[PDB]
Amino acid sequence: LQSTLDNIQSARPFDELTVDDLTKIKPEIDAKVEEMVKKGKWDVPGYKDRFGNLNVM
Amino acid sequence: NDESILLLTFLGFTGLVAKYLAPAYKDFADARMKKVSDVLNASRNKHVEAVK
Amino acid sequence: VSTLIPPKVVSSKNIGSAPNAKRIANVVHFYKSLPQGPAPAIKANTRLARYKAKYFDGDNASGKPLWHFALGIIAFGYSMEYYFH
Amino acid sequence: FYFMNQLTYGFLLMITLLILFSQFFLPMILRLYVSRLFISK
Amino acid sequence: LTTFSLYTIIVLLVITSLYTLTNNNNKIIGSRWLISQEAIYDTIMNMTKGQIGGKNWGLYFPMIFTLFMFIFIANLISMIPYSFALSAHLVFIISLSIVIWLGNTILGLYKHGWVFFSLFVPAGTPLPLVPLLVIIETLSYFARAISLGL
Amino acid sequence: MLKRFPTPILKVYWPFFVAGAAVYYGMSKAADLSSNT
Numbered sequence: 001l002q003s004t005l006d007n008i009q010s011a012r013p014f015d016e017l018t019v020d021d022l023t024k025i026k027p028e029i030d031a032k033v034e035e036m037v038k039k040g041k042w043d044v045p046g047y048k049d050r051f052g053n054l055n056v057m
Numbered sequence: 058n059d060e061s062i063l064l065l066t067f068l069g070f071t072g073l074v075a076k077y078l079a080p081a082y083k084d085f086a087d088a089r090m091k092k093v094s095d096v097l098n099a100s101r102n103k104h105v106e107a108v109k
Numbered sequence: 110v111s112t113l114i115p116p117k118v119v120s121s122k123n124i125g126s127a128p129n130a131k132r133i134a135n136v137v138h139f140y141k142s143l144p145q146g147p148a149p150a151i152k153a154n155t156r157l158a159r160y161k162a163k164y165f166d167g168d169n170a171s172g173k174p175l176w177h178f179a180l181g182i183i184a185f186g187y188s189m190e191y192y193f194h
Numbered sequence: 195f196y197f198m199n200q201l202t203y204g205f206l207l208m209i210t211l212l213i214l215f216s217q218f219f220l221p222m223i224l225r226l227y228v229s230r231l232f233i234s235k
Numbered sequence: 236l237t238t239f240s241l242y243t244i245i246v247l248l249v250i251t252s253l254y255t256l257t258n259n260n261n262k263i264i265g266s267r268w269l270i271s272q273e274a275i276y277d278t279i280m281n282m283t284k285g286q287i288g289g290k291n292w293g294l295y296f297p298m299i300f301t302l303f304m305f306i307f308i309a310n311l312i313s314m315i316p317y318s319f320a321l322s323a324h325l326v327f328i329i330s331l332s333i334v335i336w337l338g339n340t341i342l343g344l345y346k347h348g349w350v351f352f353s354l355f356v357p358a359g360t361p362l363p364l365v366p367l368l369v370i371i372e373t374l375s376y377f378a379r380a381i382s383l384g385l
Numbered sequence: 386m387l388k389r390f391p392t393p394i395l396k397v398y399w400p401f402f403v404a405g406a407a408v409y410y411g412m413s414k415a416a417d418l419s420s421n422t
Contacts, residue, residue: 001132005108007139014097016146019222019263020386022229025141033228034390040293040397042220042300043284047227050096050234053277057085060190064183064316071176079172086170086270093265100233107128108135138233150260161256170268179315182245186317197326197416200239202409204327207246208305209402215304216297216392219254223276225388226263261386298398334408338401345400 242321246308279303306331332384336376 023030036044123129153162164174258269265273283296309327310320321327343351355372356365416422 001108004132004136004139005105007142008105008108008135011139011142011144012101013143013146014101015264016149016262017143018148019226019229019261020388021143021148022232022263023225025138026229026232029225029229029232033225036228037221037224037297038391038393040296040393042224042280042293042296044228044231047231048277050100051227051230052089052092053281054085054089054274055278056274057081059194060187060316063314063318067179067183067314067316070314071172071179075172082172082270083267085274086267089265089270089273090267097230097233104135104138107131134235157252161252165252165256165268167257167259167266167268170266170270174268178249182312183315183317186315186319190317195422196324197420197422198413199237200242200321200324201326201330201412203237203239204243204309204321205330205405205409207243207250208302208331209405211250211301211305212298212394212398213392214250215301216394217389218251218387220276220297220300221388221390222254222258222261223272226265229263255387258386294397297392298394298401329412330405330408334405335401337404337408341400341404 238322242319245312246305249308250304276300302331328384332380335383336380339379340376 018024020030023033125132151162151166153159160177164177254272257266257272259266262269279300280296283299284292287294287296287299306328309325312318312320340351343354347354355369360368
């Protein structure tokens with residue numbers, strides 16, 4: 001816990017981390033994302049529950 | 058001429074867009090930027106609290 | 110019945126199976142994270158890339174970044190009409 | 195006249211966009227949203 | 236050379252660049268310019284899963300996200316001093332209209348097949364009145380091409 | 386940045402493509418028969 005927090009209090013690059021590098025940090029992210037769009041469904045249960053979809057403006 | 062009136066009107070339309078659509082698109086981009094920023098910051102500081 | 114070790118049974122299971130799963134996701138998430146926004150790679154310039162990393166870059170993202178395409182296509186089309194009409 | 199000059203020459207992009215965007219365009223937003231969901235959990 | 240290739244070249248150069256170049260480094264934060272896609276794609280998916288709701292939502296939603304932008308980009312050549320969205324001819328809508336209608340009839344014929352005679356009558360008008368309803372269902376199917384075509 | 390994920394349109398978008406091929410063939414035939422130009 002102490003080391004993870006030390007890797008948290010200044011080691012969460014929430015702005016300039018590569019997007020696909022999340023699949024590098026999360027080994028199943030790549031597989032599931034390929035799996036998620038692969039079968040045909042392009043939606044996930046609340047993929048944006050805390051985010052907005054927005055119109056053109 | 059055949060390709061003149063539209064050429065002169067292109068800058069007029071662009072200025073018309075800059076009058077409203079430029080700041081409008083700026084506001085739309087900034088609002089979503091701050092919304093996603095808060096959405097990621099809350100998740101981060103909540104995972105920090107979960108580790109705590 | 111008699112004496113035992115009620116506390117020492119933390120061997121058979123660690124506290125918080127759900128908190129353990131959350132913390133294990135936390136370890137992989139925080140460890141495999143950039144030190145401070147590492148790996149940017151913004152600049153690029155090769156024939157068209159000198160325009161891509163400059164004009165399609167989000168430092169401005171204003172209206173002129175798209176309007177450069179309109180000005181250029183107008184330059185092309187005026188010569189197109191000259192060679193055509 | 196000019197019929198076999200933009201029919202296939204235009205629909206080529208229509209045929210190609212299926213392989214282009216689906217592995218290229220929507221992949222970006224899908225992976226980004228899924229990763230943001232991972233951070234949400 | 237050929238003028239049609241030069242006309243399609245703008246699409247061939249914009250389609251890949253607007254997503255492989257407008258984004259900074261393919262970052263998840265959603266750039267100020269990248270806010271455009273960040274707003275458009277989600278509204279697109281909203282309708283896609285919405286209007287095609289059910290297990291048919293995932294059947295061709297990516298096809299929708301694809302097919303939507305082709306015509307919109309091709310018609311973007313309208314405000315230039317010599318503007319030309321497909322050289323004032325643009326036979327392209329003919330390609331996308333009747334072929335898509337025949338694809339609908341195939342989705343009724345390849346997946347739905349012989350049940351294709353069980354859709355033209357939405358509610359009633361049985362054998363005593365089926366032909367009149369089919370007489371306008373046929374017109375609707377025929378003209379759905381021209382409604383999105385031209 | 387850019388990847389090529391396994392997008393199934395070969396066994397998913399086969400029917401529309403086949404119909405479009407038939408339409409292109411009909412257009413070629415009408416370029417010689419119906420329109421005779």
